[PDB]
Amino acid sequence: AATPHLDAVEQTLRQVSPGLEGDVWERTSGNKLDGSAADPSDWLLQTPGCWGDDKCADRVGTKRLLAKMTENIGNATRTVDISTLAPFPNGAFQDAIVAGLKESAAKGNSLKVRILVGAAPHMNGIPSKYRDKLTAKLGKAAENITLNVASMTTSKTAFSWNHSKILVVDGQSALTGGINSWKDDYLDTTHPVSDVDLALTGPAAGSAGRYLDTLWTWTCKNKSNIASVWFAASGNAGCMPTMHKDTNPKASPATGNVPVIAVGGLGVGIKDVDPKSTFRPDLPTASDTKCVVGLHDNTNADRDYDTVNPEESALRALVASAKGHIEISQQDLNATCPPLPRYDIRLYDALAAKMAAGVKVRIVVSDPANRGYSQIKSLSEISDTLRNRLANITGGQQAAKTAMCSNLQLATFRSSPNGKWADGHPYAQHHKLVSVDSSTFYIGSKNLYPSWLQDFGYIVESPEAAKQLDAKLLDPQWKYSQETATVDYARGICGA
Incomplete structure (x- = not known):
């Protein structure tokens, strides 16, 4: 109630992975973000x-x-x-x-x-x-x-x-x-x-x-x-x-006084299922995520995988908890296929649902001129996917594009006015960052692109800290990265 975002994430994780609570995910109180007295945001x-x-x-x-x-x-x-x-x-x-x-x-x-x-x-x-x-x-x-x-x-x-x-x-x-x-x-x-x-x-x-x-x-x-x-x-x-x-x-x-949810995942090969879990979500409508037919997709087509990887569900729930705006900073939203599926369908569905309801979404990824630190050729691989998932809930492709261009910021990263570093190399970014409502944020190792790994991070609900995160990282990032946007609701840019 002081913590509406963690409350919702926690309810989801207890359904997905009840047997792992305390060990692979855990809610705690009484934490502190450990900054210096001189520069508390550090x-x-x-x-x-x-x-x-x-x-x-x-x-x-x-x-x-x-x-x-x-x-x-x-x-x-x-x-x-x-x-x-x-x-x-x-x-x-x-x-x-x-x-x-x-x-x-x-x-x-x-x-x-x-x-x-x-x-x-x-x-x-x-x-x-x-x-x-x-x-x-x-x-x-x-x-x-x-x-x-x-x-x-x-x-x-x-x-x-x-x-x-x-x-x-x-x-x-x-x-x-x-x-x-x-x-x-x-x-x-x-x-x-x-x-x-x-x-x-x-x-x-x-x-x-x-x-x-x-x-x-x-x-x-x-x-x-x-x-x-x-x-x-x-x-x-x-x-x-x-x-x-x-x-x-x-x-x-x-x-x-800081409330935190710790959340990780066991990947594949440690534990195959949480036998205490009885959660059985609906499968999402069909997508073009799986480039090849014989791939086994743990992200989108393996219930038991989720039960030992609560972090995927945690990040999707963090998105679903936003009432006003979401900022995502990643290396990538999509993975290279094969051997991974290209995207997390439920994640894109959650982003679509928020934009259809007028919640703003910002996605900044690493410049494709790095592809190492990129797995796409073009930002259109992200916007096309968002549009297609939007079409399922807004009645068609025309309405989907309108919803997207009214609620999306989509760009590649820069940290200065230059399109590349002074030494000629493109900027590479590797954050695994999600923030919502200038309130609650994830920092950790779990990428939003399909990935079947042992990862870990923290979800922190603290408007004070989230505001520090805006001033020190998300606001400067957007100051310089907006130049590359293909979609930017705030400037009426709809190139996509």
Whole structure:
């Protein structure tokens, strides 16, 4: 009632995944967005944060991101819990992990540390190499660290492996979002990828620790299978499937008044169904999402998939909860087909339903001149799909186009007046961001394009924070990206 958007999302998740509540999704109270006293919006760990400058000279976002990683790890007294997408962290990302671990050891703490990566699935030396490079860099600081490093694959055929990007310390602080720890794409480049994480503290960090325990329980159970897991630990130490449960309080301490829903997914190959779920939604009217007939579509044609991937439903419910306006910032809304279907039909249906009811929708995606950081040739692949789904509920193609052009902003990303970076490379973006009503927003790793992965993120209902998100990210993004719009209701642009 103070939280109408989370209330609706929560009702949906209890129907979709009741057996996973607490572990793969969880509502908590008493959190805090963990910004500094000088610049309270800097819980919003955007990168590079160089708005207006095609040379990206002053990367205030990158600097804050690396500093906050180092700070949070250096405050650890018991545990550091990291997940990411392979390759393992390098460059200044690695440097921030090493500095933080050195700081916690210097303060006299003995830590347990897990570092989990997903990778495509042959004697694989990458995990042990990373373990040994990290230990060498830590030197004497490594002596009281109990370390686990692993690369995991849960389904080769569904391209399923961990893509979550989480950093949890002591079960108390959590950093999560879209940022992979890849120096060449994010840092040492004059065309850095634009992306975003958030920093919070409170009970919701425990939700992330329970999600990581779920992934590590599977990983440890499969650690003797090379097709599934390559594992390396320090000294005689064993695999830690439940480090969070065993080391941190089940109820993380309160730090603020912010309500949060944590939500993730198990992809394919960990658990095939939530046997407690009895939810059986209607299938959507027919679409052209599946480019090829023999593809098994987990996104649009597999009920049990949803029950172990509550995040898809959570994002669709977040869209359905909007009363006034929705802003989406993604790498892509569509996936490359094959082997994935091109789009989430129910997602586009939810966006259509909102535009038919006069709720405004903004979608900003990465420039197709990147297609790596794009999976479409043209924005018309998004507008055509929105139009066709609108036609089903507005009576036809003419009315569909009118509804779309009256309620849509659709564009490719820019962060300065230039159509490309000064170095000639197109802008790439990689956020996984949804905001509604200047009230409630998702920041995490789950892309809106079809994807069958282990992902994770937070849905936060706080108008104060959402307004900060507008001023610091969504408003500058639109200032520069609107130039590329093919549809823009606010300017009567209807090129599509």
